[PDB]
Amino acid sequence: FNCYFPLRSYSFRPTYGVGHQPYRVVVLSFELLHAPATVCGPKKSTNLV
Amino acid sequence: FNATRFASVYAWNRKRISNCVADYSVLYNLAPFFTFKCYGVSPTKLND
Amino acid sequence: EVQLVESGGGLVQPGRSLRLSCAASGFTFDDYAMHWVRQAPGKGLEWVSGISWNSDSIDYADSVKGRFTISRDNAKNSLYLQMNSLRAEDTALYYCAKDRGYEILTPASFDYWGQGTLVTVSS
Amino acid sequence: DIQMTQSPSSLSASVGDRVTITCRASQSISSYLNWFQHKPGKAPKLLIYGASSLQSGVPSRFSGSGSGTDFTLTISSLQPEDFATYYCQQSYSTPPYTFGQGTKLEIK
């Protein structure tokens, strides 16, 4: 009494509506900064003019 | 809640409540009320 | 804080008839069950009779079946008990207790009691 | 329960034709059907998973469509190695993974 388990299980079923269907979420956090960068978009180098 | 006699399930009693302060902690603080299922709103934020 | 006033007690000869009145004023009487119980002068409590909120379900003690009858007046918020065919064992004290529920035979027991009235059955 | 019906059973065409096969359900299954190709001499292979999602590695000639109670598969090219038996399977109803009857395909 007055004590609840904070974890509740989502009961996903194929008979549910769109508003209750499970959705997979992937969130990308970019550490975009002046620091030495290591994740680079595909690009071609060029001679040093 | 503390009524001596309830009506039948087919003739379920409907009571309208307004223009007063509703203390939901009283219902939350009575042990005999074993079953407290709520949907569409969190029981903790009922007070606010 | 509710009030339970009982009257009708006294001394009567065996085989006579009398009436006991129990009136309540501290609560709503139209939806509560009421009971008459007996405490012997030298023994413990014993249930006698009782009536529900409405005069539909009625019960009596087995030892007093066919002898005692009860009535309930919701207009004046009280009840009456008719004492008939009294014998030597009915010289005990009688209480007027209020049941917590509304029916006659429920696991809920008597909630509030009243001061007993003394009756005597002797010559 | 659920019942799946195959309106065509044996179909004849040529190497340069276009063929269609339909699978009907007793009630709506919400586009949850799969199409399987079964060669008589080797292990059967899946062609379509879901209503209209094409499995990787198979030619784009096959095309699935339909939603609700009826579903359809179409071949536009009919390459000469497309001889097999085609099945429609539901995965939505309480009877788990019930399959429909076979659908023979022959070229002539």
Residues spanned by the domain of C42? 4-121
DSSP annotation of A34: S
Please count the structural domains in chain C.
1
Give the angle subtended at the CA of C4 by the CAs of C2 and C5, to the nearest 5°: 140
Q: Are C38 and C93 in contact (CB under 8 A)?
A: yes
CATH of the domain at C59: 2.60.40.10
Sorted by sequence, the CB contacts under 8 Å of residue D77 that are 6+ apart come out as D18, D59, D61
Instruction: Give B3 to chain C, closest Cα distance, Å.
Output: 10
Distance from CA of B31 to the nearest CA of A (A): 7
Chain D partners (3+ C-beta pairs within 8 A): A
Domain range summary for chain D, segments of one domain joined by +? 4-107
- D/C Cβ contact: 3+ pairs below 8 Å: no
Going along D1-103, which residue ranges are E strands?
A: 4-6, 10-13, 19-25, 33-38, 45-49, 53-54, 62-65, 70-75, 85-90
For chain D, positions 31-70, list CB contacts with chain A under 8 A.
32
Burial class of residue C14 (count of CB atoms within 10 Å of its CB; 0-12, 13-18, 19+): middle
Query: Which one, of C20, C14, C5, lies nearest residue C81 by Cα?
Result: C20
Resolution in A: 3.7
CATH entry, D4-107, from 2.40.110.10, 3.40.50.720, 1.10.645.10, 2.60.40.10:
2.60.40.10
Cβ neighbour number for residue D2 with a 10 Å cutoff: 14
Decide: C36 and C51 in contact? Cβ < 8 Å.
no
B2 CB within 8 Å of a chain C CB: no
Please answer whether residues D89 and D100 qualify as being in contact, where contact means their C-beta atoms are separated by less than 8 angstroms.
yes
- Measured between alpha carbons, how far is B20 from A35 in angstroms, rounded to an integer? 60
Q: Does residue B8 sit at the C interface (CB-CB below 8 Å)?
A: no
Q: Does A14 touch chain D (CB under 8 A)?
A: yes
For chain A, the straight-line distance linking the first and the last C-alpha, in angstroms and rounded, comes to: 75
Q: In a 3-state reduction of DSSP, which class is residue C62?
A: helix
Q: Are the C-beta atoms of D67 and D45 separated by less than 8 Å?
A: no
Residue B6: closest C-alpha in chain C: C102
CB-count burial class (<10 Å; 0-12, 13-18, 19+) for D84: buried
- Residue D26 tokens read as 């007793």
Q: How far is B6 from chain C (nearest CA, A)?
A: 11
In this structure, how many other beta carbons lie within 10 angstroms of the beta carbon of residue C111?
A: 14
* Chain A positions in Cβ-Cβ contact with residue B29 (cut-off 8 Å): 2
For this PDB entry, the determination method is cryo-EM
Task: Chain A: list its partners (3+ Cβ pairs within 8 Å).
Answer: B, D
